[PDB]
Amino acid sequence: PALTKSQTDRLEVLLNPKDEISLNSGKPFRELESELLSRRKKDLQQIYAEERENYLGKLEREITRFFVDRGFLEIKSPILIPLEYIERMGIDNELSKQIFRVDKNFCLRPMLAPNLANYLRKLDRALPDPIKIFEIGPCYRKESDGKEHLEEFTMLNFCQMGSGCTRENLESIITDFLNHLGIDFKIVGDSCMVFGDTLDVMHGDLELSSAVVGPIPLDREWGIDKPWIGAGFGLERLLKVKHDFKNIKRAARSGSYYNGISTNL
Amino acid sequence: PALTKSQTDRLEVLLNPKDEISLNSGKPFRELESELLSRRKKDLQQIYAEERENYLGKLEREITRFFVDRGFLEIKSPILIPLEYIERMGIDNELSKQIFRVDKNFCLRPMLAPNLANYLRKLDRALPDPIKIFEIGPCYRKESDGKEHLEEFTMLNFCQMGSGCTRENLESIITDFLNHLGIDFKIVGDSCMVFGDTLDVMHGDLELSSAVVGPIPLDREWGIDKPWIGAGFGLERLLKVKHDFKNIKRAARSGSYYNGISTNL
Ligand SMILES: Nc1ncnc2c1ncn2[C@@H]1O[C@H](COP(=O)(O)OP(=O)(O)OP(=O)(O)O)[C@@H](O)[C@H]1O
Ligand SMILES: Nc1ncnc2c1ncn2[C@@H]1O[C@H](COP(=O)(O)OP(=O)(O)OP(=O)(O)O)[C@@H](O)[C@H]1O
Numbered sequence: 001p002a003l004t005k006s007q008t009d010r011l012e013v014l015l016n017p018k019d020e021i022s023l024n025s026g027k028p029f030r031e032l033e034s035e036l037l038s039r040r041k042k043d044l045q046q047i048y049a050e051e052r053e054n055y056l057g058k059l060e061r062e063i064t065r066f067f068v069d070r071g072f073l074e075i076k077s078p079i080l081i082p083l084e085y086i087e088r089m090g091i092d093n094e095l096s097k098q099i100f101r102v103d104k105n106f107c108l109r110p111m112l113a114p115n116l117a118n119y120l121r122k123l124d125r126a127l128p129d130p131i132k133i134f135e136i137g138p139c140y141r142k143e144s145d146g147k148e149h150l151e152e153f154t155m156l157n158f159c160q161m162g163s164g165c166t167r168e169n170l171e172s173i174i175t176d177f178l179n180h181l182g183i184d185f186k187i188v189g190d191s192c193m194v195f196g197d198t199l200d201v202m203h204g205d206l207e208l209s210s211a212v213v214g215p216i217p218l219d220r221e222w223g224i225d226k227p228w229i230g231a232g233f234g235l236e237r238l239l240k241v242k243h244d245f246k247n248i249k250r251a252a253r254s255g256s257y258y259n260g261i262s263t264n265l
Numbered sequence: 266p267a268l269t270k271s272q273t274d275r276l277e278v279l280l281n282p283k284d285e286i287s288l289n290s291g292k293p294f295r296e297l298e299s300e301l302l303s304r305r306k307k308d309l310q311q312i313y314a315e316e317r318e319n320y321l322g323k324l325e326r327e328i329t330r331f332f333v334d335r336g337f338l339e340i341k342s343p344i345l346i347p348l349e350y351i352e353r354m355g356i357d358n359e360l361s362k363q364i365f366r367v368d369k370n371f372c373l374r375p376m377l378a379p380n381l382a383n384y385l386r387k388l389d390r391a392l393p394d395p396i397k398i399f400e401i402g403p404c405y406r407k408e409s410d411g412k413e414h415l416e417e418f419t420m421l422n423f424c425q426m427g428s429g430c431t432r433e434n435l436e437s438i439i440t441d442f443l444n445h446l447g448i449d450f451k452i453v454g455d456s457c458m459v460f461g462d463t464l465d466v467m468h469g470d471l472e473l474s475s476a477v478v479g480p481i482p483l484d485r486e487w488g489i490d491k492p493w494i495g496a497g498f499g500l501e502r503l504l505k506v507k508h509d510f511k512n513i514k515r516a517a518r519s520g521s522y523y524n525g526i527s528t529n530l
């Protein structure tokens with residue numbers, strides 16, 4: 001009873017990291033699927049009976065409490081943004097072809113940074129130093145690596161402007177944040193076209209975040225005239241680590257999985 | 266000292282419903298703006314010091330707890346959906362020109378209903394009767410009435426399938442929900458092209474929700490074969506009522522207002 005690719009694919013959809021079953025044992029496909037179908041139905045029934053909270057929603061609310069309690073202002077900015085923002089962020093016409101365009105002059109935001117830069121500039125006229133804000137929400141990029149990449153994902157970006165915007169403080173916040181989530185990490189240098197040199201938060205070979213210590217030459221284009229620090233995290237990658245997901249689609253907005261459990265049962 | 270339209274507009278941006286000032290008193294524009302600028306700066310500084318939670322985020326989390334505690338499963342489905350969903354929902358090629366199209370075959374969802382219909386169908390194969398789910402998230406419609414309409418708004422849709430899907434139960438949930446938020450309402454009949462007859466939840470002349478008691482002929486197109494009930498609410502309209510906002514843009518995702526306070530200070 002060798003399994004076809006279509007049969008292995010269907011078993012992999014039903015398989016969860018907590019399972020310890022071999023698909024290549026010689027057991028017939030009919031009894032592997034039935035066993036997996038039964039476990040996943042029990043998993044969902046237990047979710048429906050005792051938790052009912054969505055993984056991505058629950059993680060957003062946990063992160064929201066963490067940063068609100070540490071003095072950061074909670075932001076909810078537009079997801080549909082001017083196409084003008086893209087070229088102003090230094091995305092030359094690369095990442096520019098990853099943009100989902102809407103009508104003629106607008107697009108789906110590929111990051112939170114530009115909306116947050118605007119808020120920092122505006123809030124600095126009213127609030128005392130330092131200015132601390134954060135946002136969690138959908139971002140959109142056309143991608144070509146279906147394993148750690150989604151086209152529709154969830155970003156956290158926290159940032160600070162004014163005093164205390166040092167590398168050591170930025171690392172300290174990242175450390176407190178990931179220690180709160182129970183995720184081990186290392187920091188390695190990297191570079192992107194938008195911000196220059198970055199501090200990349202790595203969990204093994206998985207990039208959890210890119211963080212930046214300003215100032216950078218891009219600040220003038222956005223009216224930023226003070227020291228600042230910031231970091232962007234992918235929530236679906238955080239869930240992938242936390243739940244040992246093989247595929248990041250297990251954690252994404254989807255009609256095909258609920259909290260890592262297949263919905264095709 | 267008569268005020269120009271541009272001056273009245275700027276004062277209205279700075280004015281909050283709790284204020285009791287006349288713009289047409291004869292006081293010079295310079296001292297009306299300064300007084301309003303000072304009050305709004307104090308409002309934001311107080312927010313930054315003692316709350317820091319975003320109105321739309323906080324309302325989503327309050328509603329989420331309400332429905333999770335009442336046995337509803339929390340859904341987070343794609344915001345970018347197939348264009349195919351639109352014609353299948355009965356939106357003939359009206360509301361069809363309100364759709365924000367993305368690339369060739371996709372669009373920004375104008376409602377949560379189609380994703381939730383799919384989840385009801387799938388979950389019914391695994392979970393016991395009745396199936397109770399809900400989602401809160403962005404929806405998108407091109408609009409032409411800048412007072413109670415936004416192009417980017419936030420929808421709550423809760424729905425149930427199986428037993429207990431009666432008009433009286435649907436009204437009972439709506440009543441418990443709005444009584445929890447402290448909003449008075451009345452129910453009046455209406456009709457839309459997608460679902461047929463609707464029960465519209467009205468706060469005065471403001472439509473807070475359209476609710477539907479199935480079955481409807483559209484069910485077959487989506488594989489729904491059981492009684493069901495559902496209702497969609499606009500969160501920005503709920504905030505407009507709760508905070509006595511003159512304009513619904515005070516409550517929207519925006520870089521121009523934080524929790525109803527102008528950010529151009
Ligand atoms: N397509 C995507 N799907 C899921 N998460 C993403 C995606 N793109 C970025 N992220 C997350 O957003 C964070 C900040 O965005 P950033 O621009 O640094 O991504 P990136 O450097 O392009 O990531 P990668 O090199 O993995 O493509 C990343 O560290 C990652 O966790
Ligand atoms: N453009 C919008 N901006 C803000 N909220 C909206 C918008 N469109 C719909 N809603 C909210 O979503 C709920 C359910 O959507 P529905 O399709 O019933 O809206 P609608 O009947 O088109 O509303 P209206 O008649 O006010 O345009 C509405 O009751 C309303 O509260």
Ligand SMILES: N[C@@H](CCCCNC(=O)OCc1ccc([N+](=O)[O-])cc1)C(=O)O
Pocket residue numbers: 089111112113114116117120157158159192195198210211212218219220222224228229230231232
């Ligand atoms: N996904 C991104 C996440 C980087 C976050 C850094 N930005 C930030 O935290 O917001 C404040 C801010 C934004 C923009 C500007 N600007 O443009 O001058 C100044 C200040 C990445 O790959 O690094």
Ligand SMILES: N[C@@H](CCCCNC(=O)OCc1ccc([N+](=O)[O-])cc1)C(=O)O
Pocket residue numbers: 354376377378379381382385422423424457460463475476477483484485487489493494495496497
């Ligand atoms: N903004 C909308 C909100 C209506 C909600 C009703 N729908 C629902 O609650 O989701 C379950 C569901 C969805 C679709 C179908 N279907 O298409 O057959 C069957 C069942 C309006 O103006 O009424």
Ligand SMILES: [K+]
Pocket residue numbers: 030031
């Ligand atoms: K058998």
Ligand SMILES: [K+]
Pocket residue numbers: 017244245246
């Ligand atoms: K694994």
Ligand SMILES: [K+]
Pocket residue numbers: 150151152153252253254343
């Ligand atoms: K998605």
Ligand SMILES: [K+]
Pocket residue numbers: 295296
């Ligand atoms: K004066």
Ligand SMILES: [K+]
Pocket residue numbers: 282509510511
């Ligand atoms: K008012």
Ligand SMILES: [K+]
Pocket residue numbers: 078415416417418517518519
């Ligand atoms: K908006």
Ligand SMILES: [Mg+2]
Pocket residue numbers: none
């Ligand atoms: Mg990338």
Ligand SMILES: [Mg+2]
Pocket residue numbers: 207
């Ligand atoms: Mg990278």
Ligand SMILES: [Mg+2]
Pocket residue numbers: 192200207209210
């Ligand atoms: Mg990066």
Ligand SMILES: [Mg+2]
Pocket residue numbers: none
């Ligand atoms: Mg309408």
Ligand SMILES: [Mg+2]
Pocket residue numbers: 472
């Ligand atoms: Mg209506």
Ligand SMILES: [Mg+2]
Pocket residue numbers: 457465472474475
């Ligand atoms: Mg309606």
